[PDB]
Structure formats: C-alpha cells, structure tokens
Design a protein around this ligand. Structure first.
Ligand SMILES: Nc1ncnc2c([C@@H]3O[C@H](CO)[C@@H](O)[C@H]3O)n[nH]c12
Ligand SMILES: Nc1ncnc2c([C@@H]3O[C@H](CO)[C@@H](O)[C@H]3O)n[nH]c12
Lengths: 229, 229
C-alpha cells in the first residue's frame, strides 16, 4: 500500500517525519523533495508543497503520477472563521471551495469555473476514520467547509464574505486544490487542519506564535490515521 | 521530439487540431483529454486545461510527467492593459506573475510566496523563434509581462493595480501557472495570447464577441512556430 502525506510548509511535515521515525530516501522532482519510507506494511511518501494553490496542485499531481500513491492525507494549519473553532482545534474538511475564483463578469456564481463545480468533496471513508479516532480518543474534531485561496486572510470583511458566500468554517491556501487533483485521478483524499489564527487583523502574529504547535496537532492526528490504515 | 500544446478552452484548441490536420488519438487522464498525434516526425500532445490556475497547473504537470513533452507552447486569449495592445493583437509573454497572490500579512511583497519568486521567465529560445517568425511574416508581435490570476478582470481599478504593481501588459488566468510548472521541471515554455478584450467594464461582452477570432489568431501563430521546430 502506498500513502501520500502532504503539508504546505516544512514546519508541517517535520513532526510527521519524526513521528514515523523510519529512514527516508530523499527524491527531488519538480522543485519538491519527496521523502520515501517504509512504515510497517506501507510505503509512505511525504512532502511539503510550498504555499498556495499552484504549488499544492503541482506537488499532489507529482505524488500521484510519479509515485503512484493510492491515498493522500493533507495536514497543516488554517484560520478560523467561526466562534467554536478555537486556536489548536482540529477540523476535517468535508467540502472545499476556491473562494477567490471570480468569473462574475459572465454572471457565474463566485467560486465557479465552467466544466467544474463550486464544491469538491473529500473521502467519506477517510473522514469517517478521522471521526472514529477522534471519538475514541476524546478529541474534539470539527467538520465542515474549508475555503482555499491564494491570499492569507487577515480581515473581518473577508471573513464575513467567506461565511456568508460559502458557509466556510476555516480558510487556508491549499486544501481545495489538493482535493481537486485527487478527485480528478480517483485518489481518496483527507484534508486535516489545526487552527493557527482567527483570520483577522492580527492573524499574522497569531500564526507566527502557533504555527509550530498547531502543525504538530495536525501531524499527530494524521499519524494516528495512518496507523489505522 | 515531443511537443506539448495547451489552451485553456475548447475554442482555443479546435483551430490547432484542424491546422495540424492529422489523426489524433484521444487519451483521458486527470480529467483532461489529451490529443496525441504525429506531425512531420514530431509527436504532438494537445489539450485544453479548462480555465484557471489549478486547472492549468494540473494539465501542464500531466503533460510533462505522463507524456514526457520536451517543450510546451500555450495559446489563448487575454485582456489588454495598455493602449498599444489592441483587440486581436498578439503578445508573447517575457515574464509572468500571479497577480492575486497576497501574503502581505507577513510583510511579503504582493505576488510573492516564500521559496518562490514574483516573476517567472519563459523560454529565451522559443521567444526568439516567435520574434523571428513575426519579423519574417511582417506581423506586429508585442512582448511584455503577463499577469495571471483566478479572476476575470473587468475593472479599471484592477487594471491600474496590475500595471502599477507588476508592470503587466495583459491579464489572463493560466499563463503564470503553466510557465511555473514548466520551469520547475526544466521544460522550455512559450506563452502566446491574442487580445480579446480590454479588461474593463465591458470586457465580458468583448470576450464573447472576439474569443473565437482571437483564439484563431493565436492558434495560427503557434502552428507557425511548431512548423519551424
Ligand atoms: N488566515 C489564514 N488565511 C489563509 N491561509 C492560512 C493558513 C495556512 O497557513 C499558510 C499561510 O500562508 C498557508 O499554507 C495556509 O494554508 N493559516 N492561516 C491562514
Ligand atoms: N480580461 C480578462 N481577465 C482574465 N482573464 C481573461 C481571459 C482569458 O480567457 C478566459 C476567460 O475566462 C481565461 O482562460 C483567461 O485566461 N481573457 N480576458 C481576460
């Protein structure tokens, strides 16, 4: 079995590599470094994409085409858009949207591109596994919509737009693109985020403070999912 | 050799398929249909990505990893940001930027993502070929910066931002992401656009009127380049 594990930043995959604690071969391709290891009966391929939609689209496509991963699990951090998502809380994305897509000039709904859809779904199977583990381990896992775009959101006005337009609970910069690629290749995908900030005026400072811890929270949970695969 | 040829829309590649006039094999992959043909001892792979950065990133990566193309030529339409670029005019991109990338919360310049760059360059050799053909055929080929993002621009305010911030001459939704993927894999890339609109309040109407004609103008030029490869 081959499992792809993705983060956006080095900080998000360092805990992952450490948690598995196996030897990894480093393989460069398309401007990324892939870490290939064997963990029990599974081949694991770990990489960070670098930030944003284009980066994450390329890395996920490489993981699937060049390494043949049969599942993709993404772990990282995000901004909270709703009161009951607190710093360090975990969210599993059930649907994702690209919130910065705008073809309204042609009277398309926001987030929509012809020959596509506004919302992408993730793996029912992996999401159920996440919920099962969280219930068993007394972890307060939330689920809901994640909005992805190529801007770091640090504005009350944008937060209000995301909730009202897309019913999003969190905002980040890679989830929708990773899940889109996986869907096009028929590869099950799970997107896990731990809250690092509130996507508001001081989100940058909060992100700087909490990146390491929030990244660890996500990584540890992702590791527990792989242990059950 | 193996040449990849890309457009964003069906309208942009139908002229290309007709121009080559050979039999193509249709090969589905990653939600795209790739048209594989042989033309004067060159293997040509033609596809349209569908609109936007994620779509075009995926398609370009598939073309390179799954088909092994050695160069990529992109043909399509764009909005003009400057007075001397008129509807139907041809532009070859010298550099491209993702104009909607915003990590200003971390004090990064607009368009910049850490571990990347604001501007991406295109193929010196292909751009020179384009210029030689234009000169030989007495075609008024322009060169300049192209800004790419996931919005159809139809606003004087946004036009002013693009010209001021990035010194862009035209705006579209795929160029920067195609050239980005090509650079990461070391694949020479040329991006050609024919102007379909002025990226202003009436841009949607202009695009609707001129998409087909402008798409044909760009396709014919791309064909001329492949004929010299
Ligand atoms: N408020 C916010 N807005 C957008 N992205 C993020 C993120 C995630 O952290 C990184 C911030 O650039 C990026 O990978 C994104 O996915 N955290 N908080 C965010
Ligand atoms: N004013 C404009 N703004 C953004 N993109 C475009 C385009 C191109 O045409 C398509 C418009 O959806 C898309 O593929 C884009 O690359 N034409 N005019 C444009």
């Amino acid at each position: 079995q081959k499992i792809g594990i993705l983060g956006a930043m080095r900080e998000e995959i360092t805990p992952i590599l450490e948690l598995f604690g196996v030897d990894f071969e480093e393989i460069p391709l398309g401007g990324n470094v892939f870490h290939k290891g064997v963990y029990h009966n599974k081949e694991i391929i770990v990489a960070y994409s670098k930030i944003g939609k284009v980066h994450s689209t390329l890395t996920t496509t490489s993981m699937i085409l060049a390494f043949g991963v049969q599942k993709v699990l993404f772990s990282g951090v995000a901004g909270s858009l709703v009161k009951d998502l607190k710093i360090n809380d975990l969210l599993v994305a059930t649907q994702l949207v690209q919130h910065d897509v705008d073809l309204s000039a042609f009277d398309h709904p926001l987030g929509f591109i012809p020959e596509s859809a506004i919302f992408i779904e993730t793996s029912g199977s992996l999401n159920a596994l996440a919920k099962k583990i969280a219930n068993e381990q007394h972890i307060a896992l939330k689920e809901g919509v994640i909005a992805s775009g190529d801007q770091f959101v640090h504005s009350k006005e944008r937060k209000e737009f995301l909730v009202s337009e897309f019913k999003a609970s969190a905002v980040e910069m890679e989830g929708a693109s990773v899940a889109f690629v996986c869907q096009k290749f028929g590869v099950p995908c799970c997107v896990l985020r731990s809250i690092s900030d509130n996507a508001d005026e001081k989100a940058g400072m909060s992100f700087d403070e909490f990146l390491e811890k929030s990244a660890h929270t996500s990584a540890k949970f992702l590791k527990s999912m792989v242990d059950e695969l």
